[PDB]
Design a protein around this nucleic acid. Structure first.
Ligand SMILES: [Cl-]
Ligand SMILES: [Cl-]
Ligand SMILES: [Cl-]
Ligand SMILES: [Cl-]
Ligand SMILES: [K+]
Ligand SMILES: [Mg+2]
Ligand SMILES: [Mg+2]
Ligand SMILES: [Mg+2]
Ligand SMILES: [Mg+2]
Ligand SMILES: [Mg+2]
Ligand SMILES: [Mg+2]
Ligand SMILES: [Mg+2]
Ligand SMILES: [Mg+2]
Ligand SMILES: [Mg+2]
Ligand SMILES: [Mg+2]
Ligand SMILES: [Mg+2]
Ligand SMILES: [Mg+2]
Ligand SMILES: [Mg+2]
Ligand SMILES: [Mg+2]
Ligand SMILES: [Mg+2]
Ligand SMILES: [Mg+2]
Ligand SMILES: [Mg+2]
Ligand SMILES: [Mg+2]
Ligand SMILES: [Mg+2]
Ligand code: NA
Ligand code: NA
Ligand code: NA
Ligand code: NA
Ligand code: NA
Ligand code: NA
Ligand code: NA
Ligand code: NA
Ligand code: NA
Ligand code: NA
Lengths: 194, 237, 92, 56
RNA sequence: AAACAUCUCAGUAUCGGGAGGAACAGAAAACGCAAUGUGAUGUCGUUAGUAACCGCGAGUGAACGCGAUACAGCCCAAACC
RNA sequence: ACUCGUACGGUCACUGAAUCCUGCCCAGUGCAGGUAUCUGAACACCUCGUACAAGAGGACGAAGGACCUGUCAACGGCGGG
RNA sequence: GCUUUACUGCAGGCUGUCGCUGAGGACUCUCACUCCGGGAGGAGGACACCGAUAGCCGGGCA
């Protein structure tokens, strides 16, 4: 039969309807008063967290991060620029908000490593994402066959190098075929053309 | 060109800042739980560097010693009172509602409890006109009719120091000394006396504004100079 | 100048002289779906839009004759070279 | 007053000094910042790619 | 580009953040010599200055495939406990 | 920032002590107010088109403009016959 | 470098629209949101702010 989890998931398909709607209307009031990075005891979306690698276990951490909505916060040019480069208003960053959130969280927990993240809504001026981080130095995790991979030395600061799921999709690596000529194996090896 | 003087201002550098560290007190009404049992005694009358007008030191029953926006006719020894039950005499502060119309008022709050915002300069005063259970109409020194919450506190009387504007400065030096006590760049160089690079009116073989002085409300900073959104100019008609 | 609305002449379709009807070519409406239309939308952005920032040329003192010749029997039309004409009016 | 020789006489102020971190006489004692290694400003050592030819 | 605005120089110079002895990528919601076909990913040779872009100007510019190098495939979430 | 400030304030400009004074001009330009009517973008709405979509048109119409007015110690003007 | 009713654009201002945003062509309310208040609570209120987009102005700047 349906897992209880399927009900959490099912509710988040429409965060604007039913109970979830009223719940969000309430929570955001408190969230808007919390910091930029708030560690939380439990994922707001269990099914999603668990689906992304979460586990009720020592060394597993979750944190809700708030990030502003919109385009790049850019300063107008202070020297000569051809029209093409005189823009300010329509310029958007190449890193999506979710990735920005994942980075702010990781910096907050210097010792932890980002495992994944998911969205938990937004109001008119900010978006909230919950990030799952892992303690690569805790034996509880070092002895976990489903997570100890994140303990390896080459997984250090993985979020800052775009090795995150959100980091990889944002890098245009989803497609294995047509369209990923200038993304795989890396954006940089392809002369930054994607 | 270069940013105009008006633009250098906003950065809040030393030249444009007020000598705050040299000011005495942030004149605001007291906060009373309620009742009115708050009365104090004028201990001294001091000079307020930020307003070129006198201010009075007052010791309150509950040991609190604070400077206050002093109205005309208040001396050492006098007893002032602040609250709903405050008496109706010069220097006492109480919500507009409790104030009898026709009475000149000063240091009027815009929102109840904000400590006072209107009518605070030398010799000016507000004029409570209408009452109501909803709105208290007051006439501000500019002549405007202001609808205020009757719960807004105010001080009875006109601000002290009246008539200061009556005497001319006579000389640059006097302006200078006063100006030194304010957040302002002085003296003033006319735009038309500058180079084009420095001001929209700069340049030319002779001095004159290069265009009409009346500028739109929508003009951007760096260009909004001269007569801002003037509804008219001159003295004609 | 003046010009007959109808007259006998060669119809390149019937391949034989027949009465034709002369008419001025009315402009057809654009659809905004040609490749150029797509390039305009796609290539216009921040700053100058190259060719898409250019604006409509001008006018020659007199324009050339822009007519359609319709075969009176097979109903098909053909085009001809035009000649400079300040004004062109038909007769009947 | 000339901006040259006559204005050189007032120069008896101490600014840049031997830096505790890098040893270069670049520690601005007024700003408490080394113009050479970044001491006082950055935990990381001051360095720029323009300090050498681009392809080197 | 014999001016110059899109274009070009160039995603270059330079700047911010970070990993490793190598990084990154990686076991198809692929390819599409259309097939009764291929079979994770890098890289090298080629495909090819071809397709594609472009005041359709000047310029710009791949991929599949093929020949090679080296080869390696797996773990969760959930169902049921 | 102005601002420990509040129109007897302080911002933006012009003229430049005193004395006697400071005429005429609102057409243009500027600013400001008003505006039946005209003009006026996008979203949503209606029609046609498309099993969808592109697209064409309609209705509605903000600021702004047209139009009217105020204003020269506003830019400036004060001729020929 | 500077100017402007040169060309082309870019900030900025005004204005419509969408999101935040809710209850019963004009209107009431309160629960988001904003502000005043130490607090209780008051004022404002689905507007304003902020995000997005559209038209006008736009040598302030390139
Ligand atoms: Cl990380
Ligand atoms: Cl003054
Ligand atoms: Cl014709
Ligand atoms: Cl194949
Ligand atoms: K260039
Ligand atoms: Mg590589
Ligand atoms: Mg104060
Ligand atoms: Mg004066
Ligand atoms: Mg000063
Ligand atoms: Mg002057
Ligand atoms: Mg000069
Ligand atoms: Mg200028
Ligand atoms: Mg003069
Ligand atoms: Mg003059
Ligand atoms: Mg453009
Ligand atoms: Mg010098
Ligand atoms: Mg050239
Ligand atoms: Mg050419
Ligand atoms: Mg290129
Ligand atoms: Mg291919
Ligand atoms: Mg297992
Ligand atoms: Mg002079
Ligand atoms: Mg506040
Ligand atoms: Mg220029
Ligand atoms: Na970290
Ligand atoms: Na690309
Ligand atoms: Na001038
Ligand atoms: Na494109
Ligand atoms: Na050249
Ligand atoms: Na040149
Ligand atoms: Na081009
Ligand atoms: Na073959
Ligand atoms: Na006039
Ligand atoms: Na006028």
């Amino acid at each position: 039969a349906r897992s209880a989890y399927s009900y959490i998931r099912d509710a988040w398909e429409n965060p604007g309807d039913g109970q979830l709607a009223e719940l969000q209307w309430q929570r955001q009031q408190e969230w808007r008063n919390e910091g930029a990075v708030e560690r939380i005891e439990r994922p707001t979306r269990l099914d999603k967290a668990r689906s992304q690698g979460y586990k009720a276990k020592q060394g597993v951490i979750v944190a809700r991060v708030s990030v502003r909505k919109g385009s790049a916060r850019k300063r107008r040019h202070k020297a000569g620029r051809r029209s093409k480069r005189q823009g300010v208003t329509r310029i958007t960053r190449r890193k999506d908000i979710q990735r920005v959130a994942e980075e702010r969280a990781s910096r907050t927990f210097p010792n932890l490593r980002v495992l994944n993240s998911y969205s938990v809504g937004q109001d008119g001026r900010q978006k909230w994402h919950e990030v799952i981080l892992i303690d690569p130095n805790h034996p509880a995790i070092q002895n976990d066959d489903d997570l100890s991979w994140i303990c390896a030395d080459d997984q250090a600061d993985r979020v800052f190098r775009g090795l995150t799921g959100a980091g990889r999709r944002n890098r245009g690596l989803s497609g294995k075929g047509k369209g990923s000529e200038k993304t795989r194996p890396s954006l940089r090896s392809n002369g930054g053309k994607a | 060109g270069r940013r105009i003087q008006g633009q250098r201002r906003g950065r809040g550098t030393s030249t444009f800042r007020a000598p705050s560290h040299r000011y005495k007190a942030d004149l605001e009404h007291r906060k009373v739980e309620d009742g009115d049992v708050i009365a104090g005694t004028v201990v001294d009358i001091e000079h307020d560097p930020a307003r070129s007008a006198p201010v009075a030191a007052v010791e309150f029953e509950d040991g609190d010693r604070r400077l206050i926006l002093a109205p005309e006719g208040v001396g050492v020894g006098d007893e002032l009172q602040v609250g709903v039950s405050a008496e109706i005499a010069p220097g006492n502060t109480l919500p507009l509602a409790e104030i009898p119309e026709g009475v000149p008022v000063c240091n009027v709050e815009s929102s109840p409890g904000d400590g006072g915002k209107f009518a605070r300069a030398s010799g000016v005063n507000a004029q409570l006109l209408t009452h109501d259970r909803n709105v208290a109409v007051v006439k501000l020194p500019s002549g405007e009719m202001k609808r205020l919450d009757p719960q807004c506190r105010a001080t009875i009387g006109v601000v002290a120091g009246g008539g200061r504007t009556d005497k001319p400065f006579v000389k640059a030096g006097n302006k200078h000394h006063k100006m030194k006590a304010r957040g302002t760049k002085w003296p003033n160089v006319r735009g038309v006396a500058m180079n084009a690079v420095d001001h929209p009116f700069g340049g030319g073989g002779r001095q004159h504004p290069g265009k009409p002085k009346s500028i739109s409300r929508n003009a951007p900073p760096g260009r909004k100079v001269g007569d801002i959104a003037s509804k008219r100019t001159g003295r004609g008609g | 100048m003046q010009m007959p609305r109808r007259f006998n002449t060669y119809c390149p379709h019937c391949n034989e002289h027949q009465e034709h009807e002369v008419e001025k070519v009315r402009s057809g409406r654009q659809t905004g779906m040609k490749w150029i239309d797509r390039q305009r939308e796609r290539n216009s952005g921040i700053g100058n839009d190259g060719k898409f920032s250019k604006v409509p040329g001008g006018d020659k003192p007199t324009k050339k004759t822009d007519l359609k010749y319709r075969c009176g029997e097979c109903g098909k039309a053909h085009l001809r070279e035009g000649w400079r004409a300040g004004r062109l009016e038909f007769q009947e | 007053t000339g901006a040259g020789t006559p204005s050189q006489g007032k120069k008896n102020t101490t600014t840049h000094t031997k830096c505790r971190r890098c040893g270069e006489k670049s520690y601005h004692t007024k700003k408490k910042v080394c113009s050479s290694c970044g001491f006082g400003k950055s935990a990381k050592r001051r360095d720029y790619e323009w300090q050498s030819k681009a392809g080197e």
